[PDB]
Symmetry: C2
Subunit: 306 residues, 2 copies
């Protein structure tokens, strides 16, 4: 029994984290084969950041301007290119600990593990959701940039996020490993508003299913609802619209528990309208939305890796 914010095991990613330094800026890089990936803003000074011309700043850089340290081993940079907002430093050594990996672009609502690093060394691991507004509510400090988010399938690491910046609101933004930001953000120190953050409805439902599996059934009610009637109530409480695709993905959990998706939707409707009356679900007084349907299945069925 029990249910936790459970992260993927970090071992495979630990062995890819390096320190990258340029000028006075030190952040993290991801070392896969003979390439180190890191945020390109590492080449910028404080003043460059206000309006950086990256094409120009990079032409003015040479390989020796980049210091890459893997543990107590200096990696020599022998090449550099830029892909969107990621810097690719070609190094003299293929990472012996390179795992099987893919670069994946995730959708809002999907979750991943983050290996928060400083100076190429891991500080911790935690589970995360890509928020609907394309931010993530991470735990990152100065120098966290280059830290990556990932999922694991079997033995294959699917890298989906690289951390680039913190916004004034204290939430975080970054790119896929091709250097394309998630959301309407740029690696420039210019005012940038997060879109309004909404609650990931399908994930709340998934977590309610988790709660049922673990006993909690008090929120189950006698009501039912149509999909559209639900979404009308949801929108009023800043909940993402629930699509048919979402309903379909919840199918496995609806089958496991025997509770139909729209029935669970009704249970949520009431919770939104009335509240919880000081009661808690899976130890939480708030409706948790950082667990996907698949995440519940994985934790409740005991899926392992490598």
């Amino acid at each position: 029994s029990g249910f936790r914010k459970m992260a993927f095991p970090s071992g495979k990613v630990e062995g890819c984290m390096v320190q990258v330094t340029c000028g006075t800026t030190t952040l993290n890089g991801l070392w896969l084969d003979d390439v180190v990936y890191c945020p390109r803003h590492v080449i910028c000074t404080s003043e460059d950041m206000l309006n950086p011309n990256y094409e120009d700043l990079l032409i003015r850089k040479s390989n020796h301007n980049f210091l890459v340290q893997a543990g107590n081993v200096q990696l020599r940079v022998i090449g550099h290119s830029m892909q969107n907002c990621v810097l690719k430093l070609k190094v003299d050594t293929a990472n012996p600990k390179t795992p099987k990996y893919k670069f994946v672009r995730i959708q809002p609502g999907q979750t991943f593990s983050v290996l928060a690093c400083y100076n190429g060394s891991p500080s911790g691991v935690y589970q995360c959701a890509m928020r609907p507004n394309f931010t993530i509510k991470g735990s990152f400090l100065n120098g966290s940039c280059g830290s990556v988010g990932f999922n694991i399938d079997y033995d294959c690491v699917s890298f989906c996020y690289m951390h680039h910046m913190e916004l004034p609101t204290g939430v975080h933004a970054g790119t896929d490993l091709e250097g394309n930001f998630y959301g309407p953000f740029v690696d420039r120190q210019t005012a940038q508003a997060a879109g309004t953050d909404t609650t990931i409805t399908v994930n709340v439902l998934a977590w309610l299913y988790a709660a049922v599996i673990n006993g909690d059934r008090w929120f189950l009610n006698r009501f039912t609802t149509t999909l559209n009637d639900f979404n009308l109530v949801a929108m009023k409480y800043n909940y993402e619209p629930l699509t048919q695709d979402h309903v379909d993905i919840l199918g496995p959990l609806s089958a496991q528990t025997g509770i139909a998706v729209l029935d669970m939707c009704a249970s949520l409707k009431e919770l939104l309208q009335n509240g919880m009356n000081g009661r808690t679900i899976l130890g939480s007084a708030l409706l948790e939305d950082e667990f996907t349907p698949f995440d519940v299945v994985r934790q409740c069925s005991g899926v392992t890796f490598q």
Copy 2:
């Protein structure tokens, strides 16, 4: 900067997890040097479990009764001993991936990362507290036993927990790596009651400090209190007494924020009595108690590992 249930990186522990099989039972073992540690109840059948005489059950066992698999590599058992409730299988091979480690017995309140495993293979990693009643509110399924809890200092893994059993209440119990149960529990299938669980006061305070660091200052009040006056209020809300040792360990955070421990205590007093008025601290509507003072320092200062 944000705040998350953040686990230690699992890499070092991943490389120590093996599968151990005996009779009708498969669970997990921890492979350090030429020894594999696992719960001794692996030698029991269903019938043995009702009233096991372990000294006698083990005398009747031979090395060949124990099948240890590290991936697709069979480890040959060449010896067996019992230390309290842990079985130590001596094998023909020292684990090449043995990290620097200690075996530590933690105190109630203290936290650790758990690497949940099935069949010697990791499913995930999550942060945990040793509850005051010596249970842990884990996420474990059938076959999780042998899974370990740990902290890391620099490069040294301090193993503090091995999972042995789930109790009727759905919470978990186990031993230090010397095989001594935490709490009044035994590795017998006989009814066993968890003591009443209390809230880990020192940890709630630590987490309030974390909240200050991340902005939230609304719960700060002008009032102060003596230690005893605080504990009188605490006991009424099922909070662990706050000791002077607790005050001392909160020292770093009190220094960092400039808020005195007893001042923070007063702020907590009010929160306990009046509630939050539907407000939230670090995204939570409940007072969180599974973060130690050190855990907050590590997350908020960016402490890394190896």
